Design a protein around this ligand. Sequence first.
Ligand SMILES: Nc1ncnc2c1ncn2[C@@H]1O[C@H](COP(=O)(O)OP(=O)(O)NP(=O)(O)O)[C@@H](O)[C@H]1O
Ligand SMILES: Nc1ncnc2c1ncn2[C@@H]1O[C@H](COP(=O)(O)OP(=O)(O)NP(=O)(O)O)[C@@H](O)[C@H]1O
Ligand SMILES: [Mg+2]
Ligand SMILES: [Mg+2]
Lengths: 379, 390
Amino acid sequence: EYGAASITILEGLEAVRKRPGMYIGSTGERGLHHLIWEVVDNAVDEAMAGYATTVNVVLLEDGGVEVADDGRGIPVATHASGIPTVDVVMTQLHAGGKFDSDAYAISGGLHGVGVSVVNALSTRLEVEIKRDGYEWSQVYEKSEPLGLKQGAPTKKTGSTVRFWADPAVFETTEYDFETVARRLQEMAFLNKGLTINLTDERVKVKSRTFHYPGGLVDFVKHINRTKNAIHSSIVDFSGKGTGHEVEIAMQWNAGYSESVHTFANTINTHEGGTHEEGFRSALTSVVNKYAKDRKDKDPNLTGDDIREGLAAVISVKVSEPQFEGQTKTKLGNTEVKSFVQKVCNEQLTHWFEANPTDAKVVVNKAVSSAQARIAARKA
Amino acid sequence: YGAASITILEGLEAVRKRPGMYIGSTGERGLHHLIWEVVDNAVDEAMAGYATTVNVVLLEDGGVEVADDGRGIPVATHASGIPTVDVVMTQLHAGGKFDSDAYAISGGLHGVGVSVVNALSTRLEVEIKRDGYEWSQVYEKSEPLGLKQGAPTKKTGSTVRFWADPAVFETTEYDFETVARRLQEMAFLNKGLTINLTDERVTQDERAAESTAPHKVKSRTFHYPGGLVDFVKHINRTKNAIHSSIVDFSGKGTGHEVEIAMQWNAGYSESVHTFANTINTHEGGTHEEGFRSALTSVVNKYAKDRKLLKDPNLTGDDIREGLAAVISVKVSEPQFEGQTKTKLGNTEVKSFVQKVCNEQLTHWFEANPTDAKVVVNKAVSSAQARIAAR
Ligand SMILES: Nc1ncnc2c1ncn2[C@@H]1O[C@H](COP(=O)(O)OP(=O)(O)NP(=O)(O)O)[C@@H](O)[C@H]1O
Ligand SMILES: Nc1ncnc2c1ncn2[C@@H]1O[C@H](COP(=O)(O)OP(=O)(O)NP(=O)(O)O)[C@@H](O)[C@H]1O
Ligand SMILES: [Mg+2]
Ligand SMILES: [Mg+2]
């Protein structure tokens, strides 16, 4: 019979180990790599806040991942739930300091689930925290804490998370260096002044330094390095509104491909959302309202043909975000659709006028790319 | 910053704080997700073979009635010392889908579904028929208002009535057509299942006879014995048929079942619909990727054998061109990207779907050379059309 005894309540991390796909999105390489993002995105939130200026990540030999920061560190002192804050953050879901714009103003994190999930789907988790004028060591064996130990009193501040992914959870436990390198480089572009270092101590040692003072501009310079830029200038505009900011940097390449990267609080919203679509709505209307004003191909230009051969970065800095899942693939802030739309619309028009040479080259590009579609459609 | 700067959200409080995590967005999708998490549950009872009918009413006031003739949400006092209805409704990771006992194949697996609805609903009323009684329990701003044992009954089932909190959603008007298409697929995926949809807001389902005629309410009845085959007909109802014989094949194994129905149209758009335990895995997944790669490989070695190519390269993205296909898996232990269950991640399912498609597709292509050659030729023209772009 189906009744009272059939229904069961899972105790937090039990839910993560049972259904990892809800928090990690998959048990495959994508989900494996997601444990690094939870830990690094957390460290980078401290740099978004400004308390950290350096984040070092290590792909350890054994299988571990070491992520350090010169931030404030994970609160150590006794939490209101009894157990010290470190343990709360590491073992309990919806236990975070990103539920308000107090501790962290603009942050990638928001659910209070990230590093707790890492702790769940990890065999071991070690944390080093230099805070409250002292160093701290706490070890998590199979998610369970071994006890909080206090070390040497240091003036320096920050946290160092280390984690060994559970192979019983994950098919592959070996990370991809280029996947890590790529993502960390983006976080460096999206956070001017920040330095990310990645070393691969796997069996000489592979290491990268990621510091881009040119921010989003160097990001496009990077995307259009291999593939010839059609124009010299790089559109670089930044709008700021009520609990949301937006920096947009873009340039068109001589290729026939879309290279439009979208971010929200550094976090890679690679399914876009209401910041991508807000940028898309403005870019389609601006280029069309410029093409119509200048010079013709009677139907309207598609966004997909306007964006064909475009390297574009859309980075939004929102106070109260609305992310798709723990994965954070899509942005849902309805308000941010119209916020990016307006900033994008006024500033895009302002670039077109100011740069008539580049404008002519990119609109002719949108026309020739559109004419090619109708031409192919005829077959 | 410190210990005081850390808060712990108590289940439903977290859903209300971060709705997107669970429902995706507080826009159309998320509002519609609410109805899905409630209907998904009824379909689970239908999949378990207890419920034969799901009724979903979109009420004038904005609420949603969801009635089923399943077993009914457990009413008896739970181990936690509270009615099991209460647990199911007010607690996350609380459910009967963690093991395969109560439900063999079910969309639900996280135990978050119907509790999220309650969290994002200003009112959720519940009527359960089980244990020889009609049980009622009202949830006002998530909080239960008392379980009532009413009229005796031999009849069984659940009736969930929620009211999405306008404080959460950008808009609260549900789109009937969004609802009709989603409930429709559920009836294609489940052969013996009948889903009734009725919109109490809309009134449409000589002129003198039309006035005197009783006042109808907008209604649809979804029952499809033709299953996936009648689903492939539905997709190609507005697309010209290139081959008559609809592809229909099954595949049962270790901890999964796979049903494929596919037919090619004159179109240039890929209409490949994938489902894991009736859930719309519209962001693809292992089953789709397993099918894609098997379909690429089958078509290629057929074209190589028949000398229909043998000479360049036949990508899957040009084989699926103008393909109406439905990939429905019944996985005992499913994997999903988040509460929205957008992508099916079961690695073993990929290889399983690959081999089932590999053997049965070849079997179909060999059995029907009249239909087979016309498909390969459509992939031939729609390959030159690809290279035309270059
Ligand atoms: N490296 C760190 N330095 C300082 N504070 C940290 C660090 N890592 C985690 N925290 C704190 O611990 C909390 C919990 O982390 P986490 O579990 O990732 O949830 P979250 O960051 O609030 N949101 P989310 O990332 O969406 O799950 C955070 O809110 C931070 O306040
Ligand atoms: N209409 C119903 N009839 C009988 N039992 C139900 C019904 N709806 C929900 N339940 C029970 O309540 C439990 C919890 O529901 P729910 O919150 O939607 O999570 P879930 O069904 O386990 N799955 P999920 O959608 O992944 O969160 C289910 O597992 C069922 O056992
Ligand atoms: Mg985080
Ligand atoms: Mg469910």
